[PDB]
Amino acid sequence: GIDYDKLIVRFGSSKIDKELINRIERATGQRPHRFLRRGIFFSHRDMNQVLDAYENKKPFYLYTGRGPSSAMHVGHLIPFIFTKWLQDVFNVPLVIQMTDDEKYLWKDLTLDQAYSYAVENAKDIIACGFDINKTFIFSDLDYMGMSSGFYKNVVKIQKHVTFNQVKGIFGFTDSDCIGKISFPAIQAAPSFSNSFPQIFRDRTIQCLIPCAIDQDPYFRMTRDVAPRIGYPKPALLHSTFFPALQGAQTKDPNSSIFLTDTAKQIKTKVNKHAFSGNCDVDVSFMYLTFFLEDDDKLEQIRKDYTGAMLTGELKKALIEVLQPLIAEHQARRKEVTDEIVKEFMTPRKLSFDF
Amino acid sequence: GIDYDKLIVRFGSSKIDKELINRIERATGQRPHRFLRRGIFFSHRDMNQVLDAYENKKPFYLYTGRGPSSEAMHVGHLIPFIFTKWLQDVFNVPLVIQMTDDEKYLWKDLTLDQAYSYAVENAKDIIACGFDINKTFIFSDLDYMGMSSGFYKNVVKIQKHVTFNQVKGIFGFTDSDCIGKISFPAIQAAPSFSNSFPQIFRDRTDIQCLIPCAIDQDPYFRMTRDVAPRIGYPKPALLHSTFFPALNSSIFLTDTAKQIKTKVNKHAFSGGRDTIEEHNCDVDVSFMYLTFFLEDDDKLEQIRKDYTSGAMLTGELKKALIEVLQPLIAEHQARRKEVTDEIVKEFMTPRKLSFD
């Protein structure tokens, strides 16, 4: 139905970016061997844009968002796994925003629930393996009251964005609460460095937002307001993978695969559901391509197996990567103490190494 | 045309409330010598609930606000503070004063550094009213928002339960307006709950808020009272009074004694011209200022016995306002110089305020 033989060939078609691998090798004495399939997880020129700055010693930090929902599922972990990888490759500061206030505003939660879901989620985020010395994780509700810059930038962004603009970007009506309407300024503020006195304490510092789609409402607004307050707009890591992943996972969710699920619960959920505008882009296939580290394993399945029979090893392949991935994650998350969470959420100076 | 003799008769025909004066002496220990002409200066009804609370020893704190004007303060901007200070004196209660420098930034052509500087400068004028440094927390929104574990959390709670439609009606916002304005009423409501101020009230659940405010123009404060139980908090008490406002020509606090004389003689006490660009619909700005700033209860009665067999209304009323204003501004100007930057820091420093 969805035609996976095409999707495996289309994945194979684009060769690995050896010239970029070399350019990474020069800037940092490192052999990257993942996410280098050409154009997929990032665009060749946007990486060259980053590499320029890293080679020219222009400081930049990574920024990534989060929505604290009561558990995580595998798709939500993907952005962070990639972001860690970037972070290791360039040894760059990372700011992670827990939009707990956002979840309270949009959803049926107590403040305290939304705050508790952020703190708990941070354990899953921390369990992806982020370096503490390059990583600040913060909750909007807590950080707003312990920052001499963050609210000031929120107020600046708020002055230079109208209802009309957010109405046209986010589709807010007049029935919507005033929290929702002014929130986009909160999501935009981390893209500017002086929002964090304790973390950066410095004059300009760019921002880089990986896993980021060009038609994202929050990204579009931040872009638009940035020059109006004389700040540099955040750099965006354009990719085919991420826009398609959002464009796939839009399709109803009841037994989506959770990070709490047992090895059996994984195996059940995959067989009963997985592998069965329209590019014909199955979410289960994109999970395989992201999680597979064996480069030649998809084309190995393709050549051997012939649909119906093909799906069999396609389901079996996803189990073999998801089973150890969730199990290890449970192991790691169990040793992320509340103390370690507070350590990560403590404001403190991050440095630019090269 | 405004009929000033009719208004004096209206004012005068309200009797002096000794039932209140007796009850305040019993509760506080001293008799107040101002603002007790029944119905004029506050709501007698509201003041009784205030007395019930003070007599039952329910802790309450005062909250008033301000947009710090980039141009110098008009005499009428002291009116809320002079009355708020009078409240603090009789009841000996904690007061919280909010500088809404963020409001002024959003509304005016200002830098953040400028708006804050005006907040700090306006705090001197405020402090010069004579508020108790032991019972009074002045704060900048821009500055305090980043130093409080409780304030922003309350903003967010209030934000969820107030809509654009609601604030559109009250404040008259449109889609052309910036999003900061639309969401600003949360910031204004937030000080109505003690736990916005952790270092001031130590997260005690027993405290409530008293908010003096204008009669009729209170539809916002009603909405703030409606949201309180939706987010688990007690409703703020209100103390209605005409002499609170709603939500170059004028008399400034920097003006010379003769500048005061000029401006009154020229602009005051006339149906045509006004004393303040935008000001109880029968009454003038001139008459209200006079009625407030007079401490002599019997002065307007006598201005009627004088005249009606004597001198002119406009002349006699202008006279009475000059003699009332000139000292107030002078005594303000002199006292404002004794307010050093260190005293402002003390007023603006988060610290505990006790009850008595």
Side-chain angles (χ1 to χ4, degrees), chain A residues 101 104-105 107 144-147 151 155-156 158-164 174-179 182, chain B residues 102 105 108 145-148 152 156-157 159-165 175-179 182-183 187:
Chain A
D101 53 354
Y104 169 78
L105 261 31
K107 311 213 157 167
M144 187 72 69
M146 65 198 191
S147 183
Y151 180 68
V155 174
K156 281 180 164 182
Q158 279 176 342
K159 199 184 172 183
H160 300 78
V161 173
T162 69
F163 182 82
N164 285 126
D174 300 353
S175 312
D176 286 327
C177 72
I178 67 191
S182 62
Chain B
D102 54 353
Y105 168 79
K108 264 62 175 181
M145 187 66 73
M147 303 179 182
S148 181
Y152 180 63
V156 174
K157 288 174 173 187
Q159 272 176 350
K160 183 175 186 65
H161 299 76
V162 178
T163 67
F164 174 76
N165 275 332
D175 303 2
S176 289
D177 291 316
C178 67
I179 59 183
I182 291 160
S183 76
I187 311 270

Side-chain angles (χ1 to χ4, degrees), chain A residues 123-218 220-249:
Chain A
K123 299 183 174 183
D124 302 272
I125 288 159
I126 291 156
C128 294
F130 294 96
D131 186 331
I132 349 296
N133 301 328
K134 319 167 173 55
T135 303
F136 181 55
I137 300 174
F138 77 97
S139 107
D140 289 345
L141 298 167
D142 281 9
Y143 189 63
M144 187 72 69
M146 65 198 191
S147 183
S148 62
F150 197 89
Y151 180 68
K152 296 195 191 204
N153 279 358
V154 167
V155 174
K156 281 180 164 182
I157 296 152
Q158 279 176 342
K159 199 184 172 183
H160 300 78
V161 173
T162 69
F163 182 82
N164 285 126
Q165 292 170 25
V166 300
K167 192 202 175 170
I169 295 161
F170 303 90
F172 303 141
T173 67
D174 300 353
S175 312
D176 286 327
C177 72
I178 67 191
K180 287 186 178 186
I181 293 160
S182 62
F183 173 72
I186 308 290
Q187 194 85 70
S191 296
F192 314 119
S193 78
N194 61 322
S195 294
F196 318 96
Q198 315 94 324
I199 286 60
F200 299 118
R201 53 177 68 177
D202 195 358
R203 194 135 143 259
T204 52
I205 303 185
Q206 306 285 108
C207 182
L208 205 193
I209 306 181
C211 319
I213 295 74
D214 207 355
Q215 65 272 36
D216 191 287
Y218 290 104
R220 288 207 311 287
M221 199 214 69
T222 311
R223 275 190 149 192
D224 297 354
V225 72
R228 301 207 274 265
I229 50 170
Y231 292 160
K233 65 145 145 61
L236 213 68
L237 202 59
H238 294 195
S239 70
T240 64
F241 177 85
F242 284 103
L245 210 202
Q246 314 324 316
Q249 78 189 8

Side-chain angles (χ1 to χ4, degrees), chain B residues 132-203:
Chain B
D132 190 349
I133 194 163
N134 302 327
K135 298 283 196 183
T136 313
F137 179 57
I138 304 176
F139 75 94
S140 150
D141 281 351
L142 293 169
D143 200 55
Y144 186 62
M145 187 66 73
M147 303 179 182
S148 181
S149 69
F151 196 94
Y152 180 63
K153 281 162 202 165
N154 282 345
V155 172
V156 174
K157 288 174 173 187
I158 297 154
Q159 272 176 350
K160 183 175 186 65
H161 299 76
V162 178
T163 67
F164 174 76
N165 275 332
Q166 287 182 82
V167 303
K168 168 159 178 174
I170 293 159
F171 302 93
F173 303 145
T174 56
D175 303 2
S176 289
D177 291 316
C178 67
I179 59 183
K181 292 183 184 193
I182 291 160
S183 76
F184 187 73
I187 311 270
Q188 221 151 227
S192 322
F193 315 95
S194 58
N195 81 318
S196 292
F197 308 98
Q199 231 170 334
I200 290 67
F201 299 126
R202 297 287 191 74
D203 299 316

